[PDB]
């Protein structure tokens, strides 16, 4: 179970690469399924230094857009840097011009980064690469050309937005960002972008605030990375990782310098009625953790099931993700993670109906969970999770599901990237009911978030494949490849090898063609 990486091949995930001018034909081993037709689109950093000025953090390198195309069993690979302000101005001036998450730039107002290195998602007929700021970047998903920059503040009152909007079957987009909501107060706004309507105009110009969540601290919003969505409810988790706005507006500093941990609050969970557009005043509380990715959320009788990838503790996990740390040799990478928060997959169960006559008791009356929710006299509901996966410094992270058909609904399976002291080195499948797992790994191979693609005529939940981009440096070996696994048991079906390196990618999607 404890796998070692003494060769240090994971360092290639963080080495600069060049863009291609046209797509590259990939060498196929095994058999690419013939129904797999479309484009795997993924974002990540590709330039980790501008000349002699280095980027310091994992989330600083300049956005590179990757694409693997699949048709009739053949595969191509293409990549282009996103022509953002951050990238363009850095190429023009031959230096780092915009301040990135953990890299301050040396020398009009505050120039917020639009380095869209995190994720890509559809709004209407368009696709937008994003990071976590107010700026998103329209891209062409066939050529990978950078179409335009969009400033979300032109359309709605929010200071940022997550790279994990939820998208319903009709194309309706929901997302969360903090704002200066009320009188002398901070809040978090849920924005809804409708699908493309008859009049064919930009759906973003029809953005609106659906509902607002209160903040635990008047002047300090929590860092929100993702959130939960069901047909009827929105779920938001407020962690003790706080953004100090006073400290940001003072400054030259970077984004990381403005984060702090609130030691006493623990985690507050909030639910809103999605259709009635109304915050529900249920004071759900639990112990402290970092949270980046919701796995999935759904309704079961009068309860919300909330599956989370947690990190136990209140220190901000991103402190362990500086490039210097991740480029260290293996023994030192392990040492660096010794005092880090511990990863754990957790199921929380939130009762929707709080009856006073149950004060002091466990309200989770469901038959198939060990999660609990205690109603206290002060009207807080204290929650304990059911643990679904727990491995020592072995994270099930970057979770993916059969989203289109089981997102926001009762489900059984999640796929994830396994992180070993923060270094990605395996792919995982988790049965969230039985807790059985499947694993894929090979020595000296470092994979990316697995994306699920259904067989188009699937009736079962895991009838399909997962795709992952893998780096595998070494003598007598192709430096990278696209991996295709059978979603049933994570056995290898095919892989598509390329002869150039591919750096780390965070998120992406499969666009059926």
Q: Cβ distance 350 to 306 under 8 Å? A: yes
Identify which of residues 367 and 476 has a Cβ nearer to its own copies in the complex. Answer: 367
* 47-to-80, 91, 138, 461, 502 alpha-carbon distances in Å: 11, 11, 20, 38, 11
Q: Which stretch binds its own copies (CB under 8 A): 69-77, 144-152, 218-226, 364-372?
A: 364-372
- 225 a known binding residue? yes
Query: By CB under 8 A, is residue 356 in contact with its own copies?
Result: no
Residue range at the interface with its own copies (CB under 8 A); choices 95-103, 109-117, 144-152, 257-265: 257-265
Alpha-carbon distance of 241 to 313, in angstroms, equals 10
Q: How far is the CB of 10 from its own copies (least distance, A)?
A: 19
Among the listed residues 197, 196, 138, 129, the one whose alpha carbon sits nearest the alpha carbon of residue 165: 129
At closest approach, how far in Å is the CB of 288 from its own copies? 7
Radius of gyration for the alpha carbons in the chain, expressed in angstroms and rounded: 22
Choice between 373 and 453, CB closer to its own copies: 373
Residue 275 or 338 having the CB closest to its own copies: 338
Asked if 268 touches its own copies (CB under 8 A), the answer is no
Is 507 flagged in the annotation as binding?
A: yes
Residue 436 binds its own copies, judged by CB under 8 A: no
CB 407 within 8 A of CB 401: yes
Closest CA to 379 of 351, 418, 415: 351
For position 299 contacting its own copies by CB under 8 A, the verdict is no
Q: How far is the CB of 339 from its own copies (least distance, A)?
A: 4
User: Judged by CB under 8 A, which of 49, 257, 315, 328 binds its own copies?
Assistant: 315
Find the part of the chain contacting its own copies (CB under 8 A) among 192-200, 242-250, 291-299, 313-321: 313-321
C-alpha of 124 from chain center: 21
- Which residue, 145 or 300, is less far from its own copies as judged by CB? 300
Residue 384 in the binding site for its own copies (CB under 8 A): yes
Which region, judged by CB under 8 A, interacts with its own copies, from 98-106, 153-161, 297-305, 368-376?
368-376
- What minimum distance in Å lies between the beta carbon of 424 and its own copies? 19
Whichever of 110 and 357 has its CB closer to its own copies, that residue is 357
Instruction: Tell the smallest beta-carbon distance from residue 307 to its own copies (Å).
Output: 15
DSSP H or E segment with residue 238: strand 233-238
First-to-last C-alpha distance (Å) of the chain:
39
Query: Between the CA of residue 204 and those of 145, 192, 195, what are the distances in Å?
Result: 20, 9, 9
Interaction between residue 314 and its own copies (CB under 8 A) = yes
Nearer to its own copies (CB atom), residue 390 or residue 501? 390
The residue among 257 and 273 lying less far from its own copies, judged by its C-beta, is: 257
State which residue, 222 or 472, has the beta carbon closest to its own copies.
Answer: 222
Query: From CA 157, how far away is CA 458, in angstroms rounded?
Result: 41
Q: Which of 172, 261, 336, 431 lies at the binding interface for its own copies (CB under 8 A)?
A: 261
Q: Quick check: 377 binds its own copies (CB under 8 A)?
A: yes
Q: Which two tokens stand for residue 261?
A: 């941990």
Stretch in the footprint of its own copies (CB under 8 A) among 60-68, 387-395, 423-431, 479-487: 387-395
Report d(CA 310, CA 292) in Å as an integer: 7
Residue 161 CB, nearest approach to its own copies (Å): 29
For residue 343, give every residue at least 6 positions away whose Cβ sits within 8 Å of its Cβ, in sequence order, or none.
309, 310, 311, 312, 390, 391, 393, 394, 395, 396, 397, 419
Site string for its own copies, 390-429 (x = CB under 8 A): xxxx------------------------------------
| Euclidean distance between CA atoms 220 and 324, whole angstroms | 29
Minimum gap (Å) between residue 149 Cβ and its own copies: 38
> According to CB under 8 A, which one of 89, 312, 327, 511 is a site residue for its own copies?
312
List of residues 6+ apart from 385 with CB closer than 8 A: 286, 308, 310, 346, 347, 348, 371
The four Cα atoms 415, 418, 423, 424 give a dihedral, to 10 degrees, of: -40
Q: Is 431 in the site for its own copies (CB under 8 A)?
A: no
- State yes or no: residue 374 binds its own copies (CB under 8 A): yes
Q: Which residues contact 84 (CB under 8 A, 6 or more apart)?
A: 62, 63, 114, 115, 116, 135, 137, 146, 149
Whole-Å CA distances, 395 to 319, 391, 432: 16, 7, 15
x/- mask, its own copies, residues 326-345, rule CB under 8 A, reads: ------------xxxxxxx-
Query: Does 367 participate in binding its own copies (rule CB under 8 A)?
Result: yes
Q: How far apart are CA 205 and CA 188, in angstroms?
A: 20
Quick check: 257 binds its own copies (CB under 8 A)? no
Least separation in angstroms between CB 342 and its own copies: 5
Q: Minimum distance from CB of 376 to its own copies (Å)?
A: 5
Burial 256-274 (b: 16+ CB within 10 A, else e): bebbebbeebbbbbbbbeb
Helix (H) or strand (E) holding 309: strand 303-312
Q: How far is the CB of 437 from its own copies (least distance, A)?
A: 12
| Binding residue positions for Fe cation | 164, 225, 293, 507
Chain residues in the site for its own copies (CB under 8 A): 2, 261, 263-264, 286-288, 312-315, 338-344, 358, 360-365, 367-372, 374, 376-378, 382, 384, 386-387, 390-393
């Amino acid at each position: 179970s404890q796998v070692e990486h003494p060769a240090g091949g994971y360092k290639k995930l963080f080495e600069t690469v060049e863009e291609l001018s046209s797509p590259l034909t990939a060498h196929v081993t095994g058999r690419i399924p013939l129904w797999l037709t479309g484009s795997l689109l993924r974002c990540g950093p590709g330039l980790f230094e501008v000349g002699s000025e280095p980027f310091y953090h994992l989330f600083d390198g300049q956005a590179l857009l990757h694409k693997f195309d699949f048709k009739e069993g053949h595969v191509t690979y293409h990549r282009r840097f996103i022509r953002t302000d951050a990238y363009v101005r850095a190429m023009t001036e031959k230096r780092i011009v915009i301040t990135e998450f953990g890299t301050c730039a040396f020398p009009r107002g505050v120039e917020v980064t639009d380095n869209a290195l995190v994720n890509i998602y559809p709004v209407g007929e368009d696709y937008y690469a994003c990071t976590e700021t107010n700026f998103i970047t329209k891209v062409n998903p066939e050529t990978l050309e950078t179409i335009k920059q969009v400033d979300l503040c032109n359309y709605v009152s929010v200071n940022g937005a997550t790279a994990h909007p939820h998208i319903e079957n009709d194309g309706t987009v929901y997302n969360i960002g903090n704002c200066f909501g009320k009188n002398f107060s901070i809040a978090y706004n849920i924005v809804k972008i409708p699908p493309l309507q008859a009049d064919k105009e930009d759906p973003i110009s029809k953005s609106e605030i659906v509902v607002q969540f209160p903040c635990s601290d008047r002047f300090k919003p929590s860092y929100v990375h993702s959130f939960g969505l069901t047909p009827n409810y929105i779920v938001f988790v407020e962690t003790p990782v706080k953004i100090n706005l006073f400290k940001f507006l003072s400054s030259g500093a970077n984004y990381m310098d403005c984060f702090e941990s609130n030691e006493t609050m623990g985690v507050w969970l909030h639910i809103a009625d999605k259709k009635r557009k109304k915050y529900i005043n249920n004071k759900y509380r639990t112990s402290p953790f970092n949270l980046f990715h919701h796995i999935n959320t759904y309704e079961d009788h009068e309860f919300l099931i909330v599956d989370l990838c947690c990190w136990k503790g209140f220190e901000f996990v991103y402190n362990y993700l500086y490039l210097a740390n991740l480029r260290e040799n293996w023994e030192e990478v392990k040492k660096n993670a010794r005092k880090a928060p511990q990863p754990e997959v957790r199921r929380y169960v939130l009762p929707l109906n709080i009856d006073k006559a149950d004060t002091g008791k466990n309200l989770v009356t469901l038959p198939n969970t060990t999660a609990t929710a205690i109603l206290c006299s002060d009207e807080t509901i204290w929650l304990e999770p059911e643990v679904l996966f727990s491995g020592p410094r072995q994270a099930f992270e970057f979770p993916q599901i059969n989203y289109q058909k089981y997102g926001g609904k009762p489900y059984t399976y999640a796929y994830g990237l396994g992180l070993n002291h923060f270094v990605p080195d395996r792919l995982c499948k988790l049965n969230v009911k039985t807790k059985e797992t499947w694993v894929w790994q090979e020595p000296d191979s470092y994979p990316s978030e697995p994306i699920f693609v259904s067989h188009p005529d699937a009736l079962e939940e895991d009838d399909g494949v997962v795709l992952s981009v893998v780096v595998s440096p070494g003598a007598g070996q192709k430096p990278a490849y696209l991996l295709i696994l059978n979603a049933k048991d994570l056995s290898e079906v095919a892989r598509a090898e390329v002869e150039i390196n591919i750096p780390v990618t965070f998120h992406g999607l499969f666009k059926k063609s």
